[PDB]
Write a protein that binds this ligand. Structure first.
Ligand SMILES: [Ag+]
Ligand SMILES: [Ag+]
Ligand SMILES: [Ag+]
Ligand SMILES: [Ag+]
Ligand SMILES: [Ag+]
Ligand SMILES: [Ag+]
Ligand SMILES: [Ag+]
Length: 300
């Protein structure tokens, strides 16, 4: 099982490649691609770590050598028009090479970049809605951290469902579904406000030094590993991701997903929502639908 990381020389990409090199199952393969000429040396660097994960790095404007045989493609390359054009170009490159591969978009704005990728794969006639994922895992592990700190739980034993989008008011953590933990109405609003603004927390603390890179690589690594495990045939692998589903709330929407040997095996229901959550859901659907349309019009 081969994972291709497009944009592997950036902050997110290098952290993701390090975690995949050290945590991918034995026998996996890892290919790094980035326009930065350092990328082949990034792979040789990681190649000295003693794990059973073959790794090779590529540069230049042609990513196709890195994409050959890839079963999973994670795109973290990357103002909006520049990043939007980068996502569209790289997804067009994947459609020429590995039309099967599961594709996880990390490049922000995820609410828009996933719609960009979908319209591209459609134009190439290779689009499979069970194989395109918007990586929203950072919202989950942030919610796990904030809930565990507030409620005095072990951070590794808390799992918060997070649905909707990946930006601002479209991030809706379903705090009413955390087992064994109850929240006041003040704690729900406060936690929701911090979870929706957590990206700005990092930008301000970095004093202009950028946004989240290390925790984003950790979240992307968690999702990629779950995908790889499910593609190997492991059962009961459930992760949340921004995907094109039934369109009950929006064309793309983050929800629990049973993963399988072909990507999505079943889109699980979001479950019961509290009054606060159902109101936060319908209050942000307009912004989410506009996020999607922005990506749809960028391609069309
Ligand atoms: Ag392939
Ligand atoms: Ag291929
Ligand atoms: Ag696949
Ligand atoms: Ag797939
Ligand atoms: Ag992210
Ligand atoms: Ag979730
Ligand atoms: Ag989930």
């Amino acid at each position: 099982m081969k994972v291709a990381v497009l944009g592997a020389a950036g902050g997110i990409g290098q952290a993701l490649a390090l975690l995949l090199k050290t945590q991918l199952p034995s026998g996996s393969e890892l290919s790094l691609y980035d326009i930065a000429p350092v990328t082949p040396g990034v792979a040789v660097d990681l190649s000295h770590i003693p794990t059973a994960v073959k790794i090779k790095g590529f540069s230049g404007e042609d990513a196709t050598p890195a994409l050959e045989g890839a079963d999973v493609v994670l795109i973290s390359a990357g103002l909006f028009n520049v990043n939007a054009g980068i996502v569209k170009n790289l997804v067009q490159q994947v459609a020429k090479t590995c039309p099967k591969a599961c594709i996880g978009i990390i490049t922000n704005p995820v609410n828009t970049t996933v719609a960009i990728a979908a319209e591209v794969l459609k134009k190439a006639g290779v689009y499979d809605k069970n194989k395109l994922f918007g990586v929203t895992t950072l919202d989950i592990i942030r919610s796990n951290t904030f809930v565990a700190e507030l409620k005095g739980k072990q951070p590794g034993e808390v799992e918060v469902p997070v649905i909707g989008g990946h930006s601002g008011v479209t991030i809706l953590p379903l705090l009413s579904q955390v087992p064994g933990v109850s929240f006041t109405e003040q704690e729900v609003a406060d936690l929701t406000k911090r979870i929706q603004n957590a990206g700005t927390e990092v930008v301000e603390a970095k004093a202009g030094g950028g946004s989240a890179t290390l925790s984003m690589g950790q979240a992307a690594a968690r999702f990629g590993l779950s995908l790889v495990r499910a593609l190997q045939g492991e059962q009961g692998v459930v992760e949340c991701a921004y995907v094109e589903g039934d369109g009950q709330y929006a064309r793309f929407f983050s929800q629990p997903l049973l993963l399988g040997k072909n990507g999505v095996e079943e889109r699980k229901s979001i479950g019961t929502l509290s009054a606060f959550e159902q109101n936060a859901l319908e209050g942000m659907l307009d912004t989410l639908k506009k996020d999607i349309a922005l990506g749809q019009e960028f391609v069309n």
